[PDB]
Design an enzyme around this catalytic site. Structure first.
Site, PDB file in Angstrom:
ATOM      1  N   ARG A  77      14.457 -33.762  -6.185  1.00 28.98           N
ATOM      2  CA  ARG A  77      14.900 -33.553  -4.615  1.00 28.98           C
ATOM      3  C   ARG A  77      16.275 -34.826  -4.709  1.00 28.98           C
ATOM      4  NH1 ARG A  77      12.795 -30.327  -1.311  1.00 28.98           N
ATOM      5  NH2 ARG A  77      13.078 -32.169   0.098  1.00 28.98           N
ATOM      6  N   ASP A 136      16.488 -41.644   8.906  1.00 22.78           N
ATOM      7  CA  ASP A 136      16.234 -40.012   9.352  1.00 22.78           C
ATOM      8  C   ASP A 136      17.136 -39.984  10.578  1.00 22.78           C
ATOM      9  OD1 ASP A 136      15.115 -38.016  10.639  1.00 22.78           O
ATOM     10  OD2 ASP A 136      13.426 -38.057   9.041  1.00 22.78           O
ATOM     11  N   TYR A 168       5.025 -41.255  10.925  1.00 19.98           N
ATOM     12  CA  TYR A 168       6.312 -40.978   9.877  1.00 19.98           C
ATOM     13  C   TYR A 168       7.507 -41.940  10.716  1.00 19.98           C
ATOM     14  CZ  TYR A 168      10.338 -39.167   8.025  1.00 19.98           C
ATOM     15  OH  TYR A 168      11.678 -38.957   7.536  1.00 19.98           O
TER      16      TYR A 168
END
Ligand SMILES: NC(=O)C1=CN([C@@H]2O[C@H](COP(=O)(O)OP(=O)(O)OC[C@H]3O[C@@H](n4cnc5c(N)ncnc54)[C@H](OP(=O)(O)O)[C@@H]3O)[C@@H](O)[C@H]2O)C=CC1
Ligand SMILES: NC(=O)C1=CN([C@@H]2O[C@H](COP(=O)(O)OP(=O)(O)OC[C@H]3O[C@@H](n4cnc5c(N)ncnc54)[C@H](OP(=O)(O)O)[C@@H]3O)[C@@H](O)[C@H]2O)C=CC1
Ligand SMILES: NC(=O)C1=CN([C@@H]2O[C@H](COP(=O)(O)OP(=O)(O)OC[C@H]3O[C@@H](n4cnc5c(N)ncnc54)[C@H](OP(=O)(O)O)[C@@H]3O)[C@@H](O)[C@H]2O)C=CC1
Ligand SMILES: NC(=O)C1=CN([C@@H]2O[C@H](COP(=O)(O)OP(=O)(O)OC[C@H]3O[C@@H](n4cnc5c(N)ncnc54)[C@H](OP(=O)(O)O)[C@@H]3O)[C@@H](O)[C@H]2O)C=CC1
Ligand SMILES: Cc1cc2c(cc1C)N1C(=NC(N)=NC1(C)C)N2
Ligand SMILES: Cc1cc2c(cc1C)N1C(=NC(N)=NC1(C)C)N2
Ligand SMILES: Cc1cc2c(cc1C)N1C(=NC(N)=NC1(C)C)N2
Lengths: 249, 249, 250, 249
Positions: free
Chosen positions: C13, C143, C156
């Site tokens: 990935r 993120d 998370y």
């Protein structure tokens, strides 16, 4: 055939650096200027000597007024007139001076600081979009907007508006394939009229090297955002500040 | 005697709730309005019935123009002429409508949206500060500024500029003991002209109770920021959004 | 002589795409991995076929524990052992799964999500900095959606926020040593292979720029920029690579 | 029946001011503490003297470990055991010390700074919600987390994590009617071991009055957020910093 870019306030300093680096990457450029006619023409001359018919100048006042839309439309039109296309817009032109809350009239202060830093970018964005490949817009923002210089409210308002424009236009122009991003310097080339001792006070605050960014370093981030290496990036503002915005009082 | 507050756009909806709540807390109030004359006069009447000589009205267009500074000076001045002091400014008045990048003239769109949401707040802030204990300014911001409605670039610019003004003015006015803060609604009273079905669509997105805020809930946060319970708070923006800004696409 | 980079979670990935682009740019790489052992070894093998002994692997669990500092030091150590230097650290490895507030114990959830996303990055940054003996930098995979989080992903989200704080803190502290510290913040990139297309399309449809997820290579391009000489004044910055996703209201 | 609140690290300083004000507001309180047993019991005695059977102490190490979930679970259980309910949780306890990147082991540093500032808040939040009128949680954050102290990376990591928890838990707990919000001091009560010179150094940086916040000023903002005047507020972090975070280097 080469893509074309408009750079506002491109006669000197960071705008010239951005115009030069775009030209070296293969762009034809419109060098917008307000008062710096000699410097503007001198730059276009140098660029044309490198590759003929690849640079033009375009004079415009970017102060807010009822004719500012026409002026912005004309800047974009100038790129289409010279080059037949307009791939990149760089909103670099900026008025910067104190406007204490407690000599230009206040009407003038609002017109210049909000016009150059925010309204003109919006109107240029509108004209750029309406006239429409790797299309993008880069706005020159300010890394220190959340820790502002004392007595610079109007300038700060304009740069925060510019952040809002970057996001709003990124969102709305995404379906047309136009990316909209920002570069936010901290301290880069210091004002011409700033004294050396005052320059050093700024330099010493920067964590990364205790020096201002070169114009070329700012331009490097602009070039990234316009490149194929940033084809998924939109609505982003890249700080180029050497850590300056991280330093507490 | 009783402190005095100016509330802009205070004839209806949130500005009305703010005016009422301040008045219920013991303030005398200037109810600024633009077009809602009957509603404004009616509110002053109702408040004056509660306590004589504690509410007045002031009409002004807050569109950007070369007369806007004089208009803003006049608004502040109205509080001094009626009440002999001015302790609190609430910048609540706001124009809001789509301004597509690809589509009133554009210059009118700019003047209305940037004037009401940002330039009028700056000029009012200057007039308030110059005329100067628990002094403070509260700016009505917008919790959704970083996730804006499609085609609302000018509105978003105005609200981001308002954030900038809140910060810059907090810093600059702090030496004078004037606090400057913001309240950022998410979805509160919906446009009267929006259909019930579209309203339900927004209500359904709100995590905390699947409903919009009442105007009173917005006014509650304003009241806190002006209170002695916020004596150390300046430059802060309190979202009052029921978690709406936390919800991903 | 060629520079060297450590890339965590580099078997597959985005971590893989990062390692490959760094390698293509002239870097020698350590491919760190946890469970994807065949993919890690085969990747390093394909890289070494391109240029001899330019890739090693290093397995480590990045779950928080009292042995995690030792593991992290060993990852950095493996770069010095292989290549004699360590110019770049890419904190890419990440655990991701729901941890509702209302099959693992809570202490395991804490250990895996806070360990991989934050604590291991801190410990690697420490070992990276301490082992320094022209263009040193760390890139942390953040993120873009951390302020608009997925329902039930508190741990998370906490880990990724802590990672923001580390990027800023380490940028300030490491600037005097000329080590830049930055982040790349994907929105939706390569979705799980196993996720139904109809589910993938739900996410794709939300993205303004092209109604598609980022390729792994698109994410790697930003890392490549941040590590390059074109970013020599950039530290403490986090570049979103999200196609406008974080701009979209509910 | 009176509502009940858990305040962590409530024996001294800001947590004490919070427990006092909650108590003055009508709440029964659990005064959590780690080492300050005498100060905790003294405080419980003062509150129970004012209103009998309204305060209890509960000792717990909030360092991260495999038994931290059980400890957090026990703190919440102690509120139910004493009072029959738990309406408010204030995550106040915090470890704070430098952890340079270049006598505790690194393992201990991590466990203490990440456990107290982040993981314990999450586990308390989980137990709070699992055991469940006007329910809310208030997290003590830090206004300066984007301009952090040099060499405080673990502390900064924990406080940033706490921001993420505040947002994630606000979103997830909204459907249950539990609000989650934060209060972010700048400089408040300065450390036990700090010289007069160094105290003045920090005081001098604060725009609003060149002084640190009182514990009570911090507490005032907590009181607001748990009150009925904040019923639509969730996911918000109110800075209480006198403009400190607005000051550039
Ligand atoms: N330099 C730095 O340290 C920092 C820069 N920035 C941003 O980076 C960008 C470039 O900075 P820098 O090169 O220093 O900018 P300058 O201050 O040198 O201004 C750039 C150009 O703006 C043009 N401009 C000013 N007023 C007007 C007007 N009314 N109408 C039209 N054009 C006008 C001028 O053109 P002319 O000369 O032709 O009249 C000027 O040369 C700016 O947007 C700035 O805000 C952000 C933070 C720090
Ligand atoms: N309602 C909500 O859901 C949200 C509200 N907000 C903010 O909260 C504040 C109050 O919201 P809300 O009550 O809904 O606002 P409204 O849309 O009802 O506007 C408030 C008032 O602004 C005045 N105004 C508009 N244009 C002008 C102008 N050119 N000159 C002078 N005054 C003008 C009007 O006065 P008149 O009627 O007298 O003509 C109007 O009543 C606003 O700042 C808004 O942006 C933010 C997010 C969402
Ligand atoms: N893809 C996306 O849409 C998004 C990605 N990101 C971030 O981008 C980065 C790359 O994303 P992506 O490639 O999708 O990530 P993945 O979910 O594929 O995870 C990356 C690698 O992390 C490793 N890892 C997981 N748990 C552990 C552990 N306990 N110890 C050591 N290593 C472990 C795994 O290695 P192994 O396979 O060897 O076990 C895995 O291959 C991540 O940091 C992610 O959070 C952010 C936003 C969205
Ligand atoms: N004061 C300020 O200027 C600022 C404060 N803040 C935040 O405000 C909050 C309150 O500040 P302040 O009162 O100064 O904080 P303190 O540093 O005084 O600490 C509060 C309490 O935390 C407890 N604590 C520490 N370690 C542990 C542990 N391992 N387990 C359990 N409890 C522990 C201690 O309890 P005991 O004494 O019982 O051992 C301590 O008295 C904190 O969250 C802080 O980060 C934020 C920015 C600035
Ligand atoms: C801190 C800082 C921010 C700036 C700034 C200078 C400094 C020191 N500039 C800004 N804009 C424009 N147009 N010119 C100048 C004066 C060079 N922003
Ligand atoms: C999302 C949203 C944001 C708003 C908004 C309404 C909605 C739905 N309003 C804004 N400003 C002004 N002046 N009026 C109204 C229409 C009430 N901001
Ligand atoms: C700037 C600053 C931030 C702080 C801080 C002090 C100062 C000066 N504190 C923080 N947390 C905890 N737990 N205690 C103390 C030491 C009082 N954050």
């Amino acid at each position: 055939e080469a893509p074309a870019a408009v750079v506002t306030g491109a006669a000197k300093r960071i705008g010239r650096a951005i115009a030069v680096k775009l030209h070296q990457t293969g762009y034809r450029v419109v060098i917008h200027y307000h008062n710096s006619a000699e410097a503007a023409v001198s730059l276009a001359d140098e660029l044309n000597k490198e590759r003929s018919n690849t640079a033009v100048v375009c004079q415009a006042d970017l102060t807010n007024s009822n004719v500012l839309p026409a002026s912005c439309e004309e800047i974009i039109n100038s790129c289409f007139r010279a080059f037949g296309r307009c791939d990149v817009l760089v909103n670099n032109a900026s008025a910067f001076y104190p406007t204490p809350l407690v000599g230009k009239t206040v009407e003038t202060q609002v017109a210049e600081l909000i016009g150059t830093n925010a309204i003109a970018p919006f109107l240029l964005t509108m004209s750029f979009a309406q006239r429409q490949s790797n299309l993008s817009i880069v706005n020159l923002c300010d890394a220190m907007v959340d820790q502002p210089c004392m007595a610079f409210s109007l300038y700060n308002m304009g740069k925060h508006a510019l952040v809002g424009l970057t996001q709003s236009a990124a969102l709305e122009l995404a379906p047309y394939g136009i990316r909209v991003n920002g570069v936010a310097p901290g301290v880069s080339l210091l004002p011409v009229a700033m004294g050396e001792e005052e320059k050093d006070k700024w330099r010493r605050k920067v964590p990364l090297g205790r020096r201002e960014a070169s114009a070329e370093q700012i331009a490097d981030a602009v070039i990234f955002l316009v490149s194929g290496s940033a084809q998924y990036i939109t609505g982003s503002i890249i700080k180029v500040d050497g850590g300056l915005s991280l330093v507490h009082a």
